[PDB]
Design a protein around this ligand. Structure first.
Ligand SMILES: Clc1ccc(C2=CCNCC2)cc1
Lengths: 237, 300
């Protein structure tokens, strides 16, 4: 059924699965009209589709042109996510197609499920987890490729950089979520942490700095302090 | 005016005939029902005093044969039967009428409730939904399952209603995924009306049979069917004006005839708030919306 903290290790078994998050698919800048009214201006967005086992990110870029002349954009965006997600699967070789797809927001369930009627053996599933994938746009390299796009485009990343060489997927996902949670709770401080030291650098083919193992431990602690932090500042504890 | 005579009434039973019903006592002298208005299908149904488990019944059209009811003490129910001997049947009925052992089908003459509930129902279509071709009449009971219910287990005893499924391929055109799923006009009009039912009357006929079966017998599949046939209309943006009006009347009489104490189970909350307040046809069911608010504001 749904996905929560009990069946939490299922992500890292050997059934191919993908997470789909639609939070950044439709993005705007609410501004004033000459008449003192309020209007939207759309800016580029992305579908965040992730294999939690391998770290492969299928980042589909959603160009503002897709919205031109359409109505009820919030609802369209969910159908547009589902269409792109189904196209991605269809382009994949059978042996690479996922056996499940877990959506981070329950409103994608029906759009995806309709788009995937042709794939009866693929389970479309919700989750109870509060995953911080929305903060995928606080990752400079990701935000950069999205805002620069002049057309629809799909770009591939490993969101784990090289981590799997040294750690298991379970731990890598936990590092990932910890990092995105911090970006979601206080983006500025989360980023000051990541780049306070100029000797550490982000490899050209990577999204995160190349931290030694001991440096990842110092980073991971500072991120928990922050998340525990902003939880006080916010809850006065 | 036709007659359904009974051999005898050996067990205490509540008897039903279209929307009416009366209590018959163990071996009370009772030999049937007279004065049944020719021209409509009819249903005659049963709820034993002893085993309120299993309501059952028989759909029948008096224009299609001479039918009588006889208790079968082995299988434990009142069974409908046909007499082929046309002249043997007259003499039996006449004898029972002369001894005044029948109840009169009690039609008040201002009342078209039955007509209004059975408008589009036709014995010929009942017999395809309920398959038992050696019999002109059709047995139904509470426990019978539908063809769609068995795909989710005896095929002979099933209700073969028209399968409707909104998250299906029949229902959703390649490349119109969103259009067809938020606006079911394609499925209603092209798939179902033109392709399968042929006309709106056949559709309304299955719709009305579905509700009666649910009302009289408590058949869950029947109810799922009726709700499904309603939702598909109400979720279609392009429906002929004459169907919307017809549907507002049909529903009106169904909701009027429902037992009030039965409404918490027979009516699906989600489907009705959606049809009445959020669907394309939220403004097209004036009489159905009216009665639902005067009489069942609670569900809403
Ligand atoms: Cl006709 C009939 C209508 C509904 C039921 C229900 C079954 C499950 N809970 C909702 C009610 C059973 C029989």
């Amino acid at each position: 059924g749904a996905m929560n903290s009990s069946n939490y290790a299922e992500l890292f078994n050997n059934d191919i699965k993908l997470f789909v998050d639609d939070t950044n698919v439709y993005r705007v800048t609410v501004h004033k009209t000459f008449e003192g009214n309020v209007a939207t201006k759309a800016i580029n967005g992305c579908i965040f589709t992730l294999n939690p086992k391998t770290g492969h990110l299928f980042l589909k870029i959603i160009h503002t042109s897709v919205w031109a002349g359409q109505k009820r954009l919030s609802q369209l965006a969910k159908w547009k996510t589902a269409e792109e997600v189904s196209a991605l699967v269809r382009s994949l070789p059978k042996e690479e197609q996922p056996k499940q797809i877990i959506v981070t927001r329950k409103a994608m369930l029906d759009p995806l499920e309709v788009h995937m009627l042709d794939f009866p053996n693929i389970a479309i599933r919700p989750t109870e987890l509060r995953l911080p994938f929305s903060a995928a746009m606080s990752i400079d390299k990701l935000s950069d490729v999205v805002m620069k796009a002049t057309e629809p485009q799909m770009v591939l990343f490993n969101i784990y950089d090289d981590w799997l060489d040294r750690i298991s997927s379970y731990t890598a996902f936990s590092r990932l979520t910890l990092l995105l949670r911090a970006l979601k709770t206080n983006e500025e401080s989360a980023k000051m942490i990541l780049l306070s030291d100029p000797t550490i650098t982000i490899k050209s083919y990577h999204l995160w700095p190349s931290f030694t193992d001991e440096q990842w431990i110092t980073i991971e602690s500072q991120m928990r302090d922050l998340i525990l932090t902003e939880y006080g500042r916010k809850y006065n504890v | 005016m036709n007659t359904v005579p009974f051999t005898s009434a050996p067990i205490e039973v509540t008897i039903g005939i279209d929307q009416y019903s009366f209590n018959v006592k163990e071996n009370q002298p009772f030999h049937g029902i007279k004065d049944i208005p020719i021209g409509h299908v009819h249903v005659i149904h049963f709820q034993h005093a002893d085993n309120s488990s299993m309501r059952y019944g028989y759909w029948f059209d008096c224009r299609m044969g001479n039918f009588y009811i006889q208790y079968d003490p082995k299988d434990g129910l009142y069974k409908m039967m046909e007499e082929r001997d046309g002249a043997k049947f007259e003499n039996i009925v006449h004898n029972f009428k002369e001894r005044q052992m029948m109840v009169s089908y009690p039609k008040i003459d201002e009342d078209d409730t039955w007509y209004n509930l059975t408008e589009f129902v036709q014995m010929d279509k009942i017999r395809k939904i309920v398959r038992k071709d050696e019999n002109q009449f059709s047995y139904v009971d509470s426990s019978m399952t539908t063809v769609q219910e068995n795909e989710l287990s005896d095929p002979a005893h099933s209700l073969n209603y028209t399968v409707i499924n909104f998250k299906s391929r029949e229902a959703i055109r390649p490349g119109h995924e969103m259009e067809d799923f938020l606006d079911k006009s394609y499925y209603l009009n092209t798939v179902m009306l033109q392709g399968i039912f042929k006309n709106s009357s056949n559709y309304f006929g299955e719709l009305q049979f579905a509700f009666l079966n649910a009302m009289f017998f408590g058949n869950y599949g029947s109810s799922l069917q009726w709700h499904a046939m309603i939702e598909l209309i109400c979720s279609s943006a392009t429906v002929p004006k004459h169907m919307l009006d017809k549907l507002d009347e049909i529903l009106y009489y169904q909701i009027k005839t429902l037992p009030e104490q039965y409404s918490d189970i027979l009516l699906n909350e989600r489907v009705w708030n959606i049809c009445l307040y959020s669907s394309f046809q939220k403004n097209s069911l004036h009489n159905t919306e009216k009665i639902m608010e005067n009489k069942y504001p609670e569900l809403l």
